[PDB]
Amino acid sequence: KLSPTLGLFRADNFEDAVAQAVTMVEIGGIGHTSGLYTNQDVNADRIRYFGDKLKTARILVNIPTTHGGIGDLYNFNVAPSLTLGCGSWGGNSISENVGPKHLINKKTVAKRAENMLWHKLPKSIYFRRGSLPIALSDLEGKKRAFLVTDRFLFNNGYADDVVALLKAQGMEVQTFFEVEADPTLSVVEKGAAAMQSFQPDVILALGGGSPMDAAKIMWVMYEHPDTHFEELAMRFMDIRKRIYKFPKMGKKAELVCITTTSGTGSEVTPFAVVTDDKTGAKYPLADYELTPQMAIVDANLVMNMPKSLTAFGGYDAVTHALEAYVSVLANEYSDGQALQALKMLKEYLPSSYANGAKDPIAREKVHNAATIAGIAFANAFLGVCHSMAHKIGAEFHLPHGLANALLIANVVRYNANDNPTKQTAFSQYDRPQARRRYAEVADHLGLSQPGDRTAQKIERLLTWLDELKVNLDIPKSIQAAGVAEADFLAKVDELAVEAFDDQCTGANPRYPLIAELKEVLLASYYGKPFVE
Amino acid sequence: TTNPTSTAIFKSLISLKTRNGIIFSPHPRAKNSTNAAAKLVLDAAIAAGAPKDIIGWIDQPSVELSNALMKHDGIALILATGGPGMVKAAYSSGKPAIGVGAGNVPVVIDET
Amino acid sequence: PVTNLAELDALVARVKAAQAEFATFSQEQVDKIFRAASLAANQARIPLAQMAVEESGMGIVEDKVIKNHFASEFIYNKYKDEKTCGILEEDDNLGTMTIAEPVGIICGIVPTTNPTSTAIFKSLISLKTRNGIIFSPHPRAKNSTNAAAKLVLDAAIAAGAPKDIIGWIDQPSVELSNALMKHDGIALILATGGPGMVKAAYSSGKPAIGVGAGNVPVVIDETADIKRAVASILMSKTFDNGVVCASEQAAIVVSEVYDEVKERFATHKAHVLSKADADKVRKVLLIDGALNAKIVGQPAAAIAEMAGVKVPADTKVLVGEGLGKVSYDDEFAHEKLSPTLGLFRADNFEDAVAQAVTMVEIGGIGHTSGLYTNQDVNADRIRYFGDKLKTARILVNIPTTHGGIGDLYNFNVAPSLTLGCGSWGGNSISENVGPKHLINKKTVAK
Amino acid sequence: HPDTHFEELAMRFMDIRKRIYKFPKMGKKAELVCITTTSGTGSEVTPFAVVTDDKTGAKYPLADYELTPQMAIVDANLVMNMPKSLTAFGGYDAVTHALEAYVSVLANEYSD
């Protein structure tokens, strides 16, 4: 009306008035203002019942929709009834008051900049024969303790030793031996629930592979019972996306780890793998707060562990090392002890494989070498072969450590390239050429004639590994490993596609594509040399 | 015509905020006072170091002139308010536009 | 069966009521639906990438799969939990409650270039806004899109969702699209892709924002190192045959560093070109004057022979010289969206700047632009250039894409997509989309 | 520990391997963030300290692993301008540190 005139309605009830109101506003076509006159602290239900139905810009209760009462203004802080526009007429177009950002145009300029590389380690480690008593001697008043182990090893006269030493000053403990070859999404929560019933304050990780890392996982689940778990995985998938925060531990428990298998560097790495229960979805966890603060590397354990599981672990470590050195993530830092472990292993593998426990020299030597390898790729990530072998082990239940050991050969032949600039990225930046690096390894072992070219040294290198791995009595084609090959061909197709993106990604200097993986897989299965 | 004065100074002032240039379409009803304000505010601005003008406004405003500048290429934006019929032609421009208007403003009173 | 306005309007009513009582949900319960939907869309990127490979027709698989990776994870990490239900903020001192509320029914337009990522994107953010979304797949790429519609809705349903929140079209057709796009019940529309498309979108009398791009120029001065930029834009140029938004369209080279850059391309798979093959490719480049629609995502050898000339096979991109003229009529001036590029011969810094500004305006949308130069000897140059250029976004010594070594290059940035504007007109600096663009306000004063 | 005197901090803990018996008990109410500046000293990682007396300058060496700072940062921005041959002095100190360390009887495989 816009004039000193008004028409009224005769409403029936609260809801009748509300209906008439909504119907009345829509006629304007712009939701601007609407008013409620009512009792105010006997009726809140009414307040926001009414608020729920009405879509103006702005609701006032027991207030005139203007400016200027007594003194300052009624109401004294509010935009004017004008200044409320919208970019649309259409309907329900809730007006918004105007601001200079509606009158101003933007810029962001992003800068070019450099990155962060890394080297971080667990603080505390011990290493000898009979470490255990003298290692744990420094365990004063840490009062509650929890065991993580496997029923095979707990079944052996091993756990008894540590619980006795826990009684030595006397700890309230409980053994947990209820993990099989893998983290499951099933034991993890029962273990978490049991210990959080116990509220232990020290966690004892025992063994090889699955027992330790699953613990870590459910360990952290004790730290935050509140959160769900995907986003622990989904949020933190790999390195260098330090975005943004931690699940917040160091809290109410510490980690003391005991390896048993010579060949896994897991007990130092901040890594974990968990498997889903429908279809076994892989979930990789990787961030440095996962590193245990306590690591002990005794030997007493493996004098009696038989061949060639020895070989399996050693070959896993071997793979870890050679991939780590050539990794694009390789700083100078990992090169030192990676080279060290590689050099020092070449003598003590044949002896320990042939001799043990008659040779209580080579066994602990290769144990330490494997630990050093774990030190190495703790910062340099894995190679494509590693997750790919994860896969081959996955479908055919093949153990880790030898599955990759069947691959390494062709793998470096894939790296055996002069300059294919087909898919490589940023080649001449920090990684001049892998071939040279390999040759440095070769002559660095002295595996080369003083007068040689690179490729000469390279073939010497992988010949060395060839009959070296001959020495340890392993099949040379995966068919010789006992695999039905018709289905191999049938299912290698999708095997390769998941082999591509399985976190490899990957410091692999060169891109693979789906095709090359397939060539390599078939060549390795037949023991054929992948060469082009 | 309802608020020929406050709106003009409003827009002009916030424009000089945005380091802008503003063009005015006064109503043939209420233009002389609006143009007087245009003078006055520009004069204040000039006696502060402003460029010789930042205001434009229409003398004897007419519909075809309004459509011509409203469809002028050089203009970057338009600010309309008032009659519903007005802002709808404003939206019918293929150009960015926002219109300040209102609808029927209802109040309801209960027994309590 | 989605074919006629009978069943179209029926399903409109269906999803529309479903939104009506969907919008009544508490934040801490929609969150679970959120997590589950994100997860279940998250793992199976490989399938829809693969059957996108078959349905759409071109392109590279892993680019597609990891765009799905990046898109899903960006979306979730992008919007973990931001208060969108009920009260937003309170002033008990003045009794001013500010709350928010969903908008309504929205249509979604799916281009063939990214038929998958866009759909999940829109749908996921919609269930964020407690919305209902309608899809207009392209008759090219619809089956994979509808498969995604199934899959994501199935995840949502196995979380407590109303029986549907998706609508999508079977055998999409233009009249159906105009009917729903002009349907009364719809509250908004989200279009992207062809310039011609979003203009009809704006021609609706209804709120609309379109995600597009213009010709993306880069300029190179004498003080930059050649091989660096050469590298970066080979990676971007080759990305799935250069079909991503905000990708290379014009190479601007200052005077005396020119032929050396050119042989640097010649030292690589790029094929320079300065003869009648200019016309030989410009025919199919712009046949109808409207950007002939099968150069899209096609390999360099394919587009060379299918332009009529035979080329060394491993070549990656063809390079055009007949570009001394600067205007619309140049087909190199328009965007290419294929592993092809044309360059300029600039005279000085300011010549290149002028050509750049003239080049951008042709796109009509200020989206992206690139400077390759020395960086701490020239700041005057930096922001001289910054002063003249009005794209959305300036990058110096950087490719305008996503994914280098490790995290991303650059590792914190919105995608080249997701950048729309409420206007086409000119200099319309794109803004990326957010839920406040999808949510309505309230303050109640006490 | 404001309470204790200081000799026995030195007198009690003179070198390595006499882990007899306890700590002065820190990790307490402050943390350590260290920035080296001189290329050639590994002090900012070592749990070592040297203090000199005031009569005659009696040397007091302190050595035990809880002295290690939890935080170490090694930037370069610092020494582009530090002149020759103080560069050489630090580098040669580090050189000595290394060659002695390798041949030391305490040398495990770890330091090699």
What are residue A244's phi and psi, to 5 degrees? Answer: -130, -40
- Residue partners of A6: CB distance under 8 A and separation at least 6: none
Closest CA to A220 of A180, A192, A193, A241: A192
Closest CA to C74 of C431, C408, C436, C429: C408
Q: Which residue is listed with tokens 């520990």? A: D1
Closest CA to C326 of C363, C371, C358: C358
Considering only alpha carbons, which residue of chain A is nearest residue C389? A107
At A46, list the tokens: 């009414």
Is the N-terminal amide bond of A244 cis, ω within 30° of 0?
Answer: yes
- Is A166 strand, coil or helix? helix
CA atoms within 13 A on the CB side of B27: 13
At A181, list the tokens: 């070859």
Let me know: does C33 contact C156? Beta carbons within 8 Å: yes
Let me know: does D5 contact D60? Beta carbons within 8 Å: no
End-to-end CA distance of chain D: 37
What does the alpha-carbon distance between residue A99 and residue A123 come to, in Å, rounded to a whole number? 55
Let me know: does B107 contact A90? Beta carbons within 8 Å: no
Let me know: does A236 contact A176? Beta carbons within 8 Å: no
Tally Cβ neighbours within 10 Å of residue A264.
Answer: 24
Residues of chain C in Cβ contact (below 8 Å) with chain B? 202, 205, 422-425, 427-428
Q: Where are the alpha helices (DSSP H) in C239-348?
A: 258-266, 277-285, 300-305
Q: Which of A14, A20, A30 sits opposite B110 (nearest CB)?
A: A14
Beta bridge partners of A379: none
Q: Which residue is listed with tokens 């290692």? A: A135
Tally Cβ neighbours within 10 Å of residue D102.
Answer: 10
What does the alpha-carbon distance between residue C363 and residue C334 come to, in Å, rounded to a whole number? 7
- Is C182 strand, coil or helix? coil
- Is C33 strand, coil or helix? helix
**Residue A159: alpha-carbon gap to chain centroid:** 30
Let me know: does A145 contact A204? Beta carbons within 8 Å: yes
Would you tell me which residues 18-37 of chain C have a C-beta closer than 8 angstroms to some C-beta of chain A? 35
From residue A377, give the alpha-carbon distance in Å to each of A215, A266, C126, C202, C422.
21, 10, 43, 56, 51
From residue B101, give the alpha-carbon distance in Å to each of A29, A63, B63, B82.
10, 21, 20, 6
Q: Which of A61, A98, A105, A106 to mutate to test the interface with B (most CBs of B within 10 A)?
A: A98
Q: How far is B88 from chain A (nearest CA, A)?
A: 8
Q: Where are the alpha helices (DSSP H) in A169-262?
A: 187-198, 210-223, 230-235
What does the alpha-carbon distance between residue A420 and residue A210 come to, in Å, rounded to a whole number? 39
- Is A39 strand, coil or helix? coil
Q: Which of B17, B81, B102 sits opposite A32 (nearest CB)?
A: B102
Q: Which residue is listed with tokens 């949502």? A: C156
What does the alpha-carbon distance between residue A378 and residue C295 come to, in Å, rounded to a whole number? 47
Let me know: does C371 contact C219? Beta carbons within 8 Å: yes
What are residue C248's phi and psi, to 5 degrees? Answer: -40, 135
Closest CA to A43 of B108, C102, C24: B108
What does the alpha-carbon distance between residue C111 and residue C115 come to, in Å, rounded to a whole number? 6
What does the alpha-carbon distance between residue C143 and residue A9 come to, in Å, rounded to a whole number? 55
Closest CA to C155 of C42, C47, C29, C50: C42
- Is the CB of B95 less than 8 angstroms away from the CB of C202? no
Let me know: does C344 contact C251? Beta carbons within 8 Å: yes
- Is the CB of B108 less than 8 angstroms away from the CB of A21? yes
What does the alpha-carbon distance between residue C202 and residue B94 come to, in Å, rounded to a whole number? 8
C394 contact A CB<8A: yes
Q: Does chain A touch chain B (at least 3 C-beta pairs within 8 Å)?
A: yes
What does the alpha-carbon distance between residue C180 and residue C53 come to, in Å, rounded to a whole number? 29
Residues of chain A in Cβ contact (below 8 Å) with chain D? 340, 344, 368, 372
What are residue A344's phi and psi, to 5 degrees? Answer: -80, -10
- Is A59 strand, coil or helix? strand
Helix (H) / strand (E) element for A258: namely strand A254-259
- Is the CB of C73 less than 8 angstroms away from the CB of A234? yes
- Residue partners of C445: CB distance under 8 A and separation at least 6: A58, A59, A60, A61, A63, A75, A78, C94, C95, C96
Resolution in angstroms comes to 4.4
Closest CA to A60 of A86, A79, A87, A83: A79
Closest CA to C342 of C363, C326, C366, C357: C326
Positive or negative, the Cα torsion across C403, C404, C408, C412?
negative
- Is the CB of C202 less than 8 angstroms away from the CB of B91? no
Would you tell me which residues 40-99 of chain A have a C-beta closer than 8 angstroms to some C-beta of chain C? 51, 55, 57-61, 63, 75, 77-78, 87-90, 92-94, 96
- Residue partners of A365: CB distance under 8 A and separation at least 6: A344, A348, A352
Beta bridge partners of C208: C189
A153 contact B CB<8A: no
What does the alpha-carbon distance between residue A42 and residue A275 come to, in Å, rounded to a whole number? 56
> How many contacts does A have with D, using Cβ atoms within 8 A?
5
Let me know: does A361 contact A348? Beta carbons within 8 Å: yes
Q: Helix/strand/coil (H, E, C) string of chain D?
A: CCCCCCHHHHHHCCCCCCCCCCCCCCCCCCCCEEECCCCCCCCCCCCEEEEECCCCCCEEEEECHHHCCCEEECCCCCCCCCCCCHHHHHHHHHHHHHHHHHHCCCCCCCCC
Q: How far is B43 from chain A (nearest CA, A)?
A: 24
- For the residues of C244-272, what is the DSSP string, one character each? SSS-EEEEEE-GGGHHHHHHHHHTTT-EE
CA atoms within 13 A on the CB side of C62: 16
From residue A403, give the alpha-carbon distance in Å to each of A72, A203, A393, C82.
82, 32, 6, 46
Q: Determined by which method? A: cryo-EM
What does the alpha-carbon distance between residue C64 and residue C49 come to, in Å, rounded to a whole number? 6
Number of residues assigned to chain C:
446
Task: Please identify every residue of C annotated as catalytic.
Answer: 245
User: What is the C-alpha R_g of chain D?
Assistant: 17
- Residue partners of A335: CB distance under 8 A and separation at least 6: A325
